[PDB]
């Protein structure tokens, strides 16, 4: 009853030029009941840094040991991305993760200028051509943001929720506002978010509510659940940092170590519904993904939407 293998760093599932890499079956098993986690977001929100702290890393570790490489100051000072495609990784608990290429990334577009309507329209297709994949082969999707209320993102998801190939499978969704500040934790503002997210996605058909209640996870101690009309699945993550004089400052929010330990749980404890109509294993999932990918590029809804631009 020896173990299968052990992963120390991510691999690549999709090439940087939209090409499937079959260098992952050597790490999968033939068992069932697997979880998958996808990610969507802008350029520098902190999506590659979150999937790592949830997969196998911890905050005490250094940024150089993350399974999913993060951004270095060499590029932040000049603008740039570091993901370049879609990654892959598995944990001891047999949970799959999938970091992704940024959504509406100028650095990607800037690189295309130095290398078929226009490069702007092509990039507008890649994201939907990616987001439609995750919405077809994943159980959870973590939508990361650096600030709050970017309508250009909420109006993008529906476009993807109406482009996939095929009662119907609508996966879960999570809204994680990274780089949060003290004001983002006051309850008077907390209810404003849930009110805005629900009205902007009331007809999204995605499962964005009735799960992952940060209100009951001991974040806000004295708040009753009747304070929010509709508690959507939203979470917050902050910015990493004789006796009287040695007191710390009023940060006004829980420590980054605590919150991450809570999200690692709630996400790991999510549901695991059946994607297809066949109880599939970890290996058949891979083959299924290749089937979707080959059906997303040479599709009809995408090409039709491309010409409208």
């Amino acid at each position: 009853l020896l173990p299968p293998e052990r992963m120390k760093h991510s691999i690549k599932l999709v090439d940087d030029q939209m090409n499937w890499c079959d260098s992952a079956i050597e790490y999968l098993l033939d068992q069932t009941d697997v979880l998958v986690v996808g990610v969507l977001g802008l350029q520098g929100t902190g999506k590659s840094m979150v999937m790592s702290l949830l997969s196998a890393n911890t905050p005490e570790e250094d940024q150089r040991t993350y399974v999913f490489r993060a951004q270095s100051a060499e590029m932040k000072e000049r603008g740039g991305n570091q993901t370049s495609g879609i990654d892959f990784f598995i944990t001891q608990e047999r949970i799959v993760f999938l970091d992704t290429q940024p959504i509406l990334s100028p650095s990607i577009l800037d690189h295309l200028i130095n290398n078929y309507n226009l490069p702007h329209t092509y990039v507008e297709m890649q994201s939907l051509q990616i987001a439609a994949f995750l919405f077809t082969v994943c159980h959870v999707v973590i939508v990361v943001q650096d600030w709050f209320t970017d309508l250009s993102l909420y109006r993008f998801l529906q476009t993807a929720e109406m482009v996939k190939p095929s009662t119907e499978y609508y996966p879960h969704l999570v809204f994680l506002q990274n780089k949060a500040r003290r004001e983002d934790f006051c309850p008077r503002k907390l209810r404003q978010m849930h009110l805005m997210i629900d009205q902007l996605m009331a007809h999204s058909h995605l499962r964005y509510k009735g799960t992952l209640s940060m209100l009951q996870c001991n974040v806000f101690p004295g708040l009753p659940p009747d304070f929010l009309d509709s508690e959507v699945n939203l979470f917050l993550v902050p910015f990493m940092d004789p006796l009287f004089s040695l007191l710390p400052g009023y940060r006004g929010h829980p420590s980054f170590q605590s919150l991450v330990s809570k999200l690692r749980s709630q996400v790991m404890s999510m549901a695991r519904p059946q994607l297809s109509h066949t109880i599939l294993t970890e290996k058949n999932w891979f083959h299924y993904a290749a089937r979707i990918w080959d059906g997303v590029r040479k599709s009809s809804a995408l090409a039709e939407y491309s010409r409208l631009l």
Binding site: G44, P106, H120, D146, A202
Partner: protein, 377 residues
């Protein structure tokens, strides 16, 4: 500092004053001290906007006598101070009317923005973070097509005006010079200069390839410099989150520049030198005009009133969503009805309609299938 609609109604003490204008717009996060109001109070050196004091798009102004310059702050749904009013109101009082609501507001700012480009010399947009939203490459590319359509209509509304000649031909004082403001957001915290010069290298390449920054400084709706700053990055500051400031002090009691970045551009308009931004293989002449307060409102007032604008507005990213939604639903109507007691059989075909295709207007197009079946038998 009052709304523009309440200002254009009339001046005597500063009717003759050579001035400039500044258009402010863009996105803003959800906070008390917006990134637009604090921009004015920081430049003017005073507390202009006091802290803690059917349509969702408006614009207000302010006149700085100590500097001879006017400001205009577009406040559309893109911001959160107004987006909340919509969601809140929309919570009290479907999938179809909603599309018309969010789309109407998406149009209301488009034309409101146009009005800013035709009466401004300088204008700076904001973004709460670096990595400028690429979506602007389409907004500005589509808006241009809208201007060319209404241009023959706006010149008539300013025909009998004392603006000038060049003004009456293009409806603008001069091809504006767009700027960019980006909050740091806790990033790096020289390093900034390396970032500023990088974004400029991006924006130029991004827009230039879109053919929105052509060689001619007349066809383009907004110019960009060649040997100047062109961008600024607001670093972090303890000013925001005011309650956290006292707590930082309470613990102690118990135990370039922004103006210089905007003044280097305003020094060229007040000095009548103008903006000469045309280096696309051959220079060209760009008109210019330095108006007065009483001379500027004459056009803006007649231009603020302008059915005519609706002709090209309704015709010229919610529109693209209705197209794919109408076609995907229409295309599924034949494969569904043609492939088809009757309540069980007719409902069976309806099950295929869900998997065939849907859209933002698929609930309405399904009536054609139901009525087409109810009429059969």
């Amino acid at each position: 500092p009052v709304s523009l609609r309440d200002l254009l109604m009339g001046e005597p003490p500063w009717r003759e004053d050579e001035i400039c204008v500044v258009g402010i717009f863009g996105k803003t996060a959800l906070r008390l001290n917006s990134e637009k109001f604090s921009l004015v109070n920081t430049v003017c050196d005073r507390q202009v906007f006091p802290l803690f004091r059917q349509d969702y798009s408006l614009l207000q102004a302010y006149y700085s006598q100590e500097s001879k310059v006017l400001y205009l702050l577009l406040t559309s749904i893109c911001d959160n101070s107004q987006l909340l009013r919509a969601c809140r109101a929309l919570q009290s009082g479907p999938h179809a009317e909603a599309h018309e609501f969010w789309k109407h507001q998406e149009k209301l700012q488009c034309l409101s923005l146009l009005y800013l480009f035709s009466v401004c010399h300088i204008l700076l947009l904001v973004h709460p973070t670096c990595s400028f939203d690429i979506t602007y490459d389409r907004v500005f590319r589509a808006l241009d097509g809208l201007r060319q359509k209404v241009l023959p209509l706006l010149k008539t509304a300013i025909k009998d005006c004392p603006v000038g000649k060049d003004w009456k031909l293009n409806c603008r004082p001069c091809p504006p010079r767009l700027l960019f403001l980006f909050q740091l957001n806790g990033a790096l915290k020289s390093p900034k200069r390396r970032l500023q010069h990088a974004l400029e290298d991006q924006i130029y390449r991004i827009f230039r390839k879109s053919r929105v920054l052509t060689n001619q400084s007349i066809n383009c709706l907004f110019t960009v410099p060649a040997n100047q700053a062109f961008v600024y990055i607001v670093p972090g500051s303890q000013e925001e989150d005011p309650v956290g400031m006292l707590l930082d002090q309470l613990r102690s009691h118990c135990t370039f520049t922004l103006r210089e970045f905007l003044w280097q551009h305003v020094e060229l308009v007040l000095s009548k030198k103008g903006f000469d931004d045309s280096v696309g293989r051959n220079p060209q002449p760009s008109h210019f005009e330095l108006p007065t307060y009483q001379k500027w409102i004459s056009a803006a007032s007649k231009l603020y009133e302008v059915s005519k604008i609706l002709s090209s507005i309704k015709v010229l990213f919610l529109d693209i969503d209705t197209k794919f939604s109408e076609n995907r639903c229409q295309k599924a109507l034949p494969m569904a009805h043609s492939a088809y007691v009757h309540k069980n059989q007719l409902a069976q075909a309806l099950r295929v309609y869900s998997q065939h295709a849907r859209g933002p207007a698929f609930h309405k197009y399904a009536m054609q299938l139901h009525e087409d079946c109810y009429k059969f038998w």
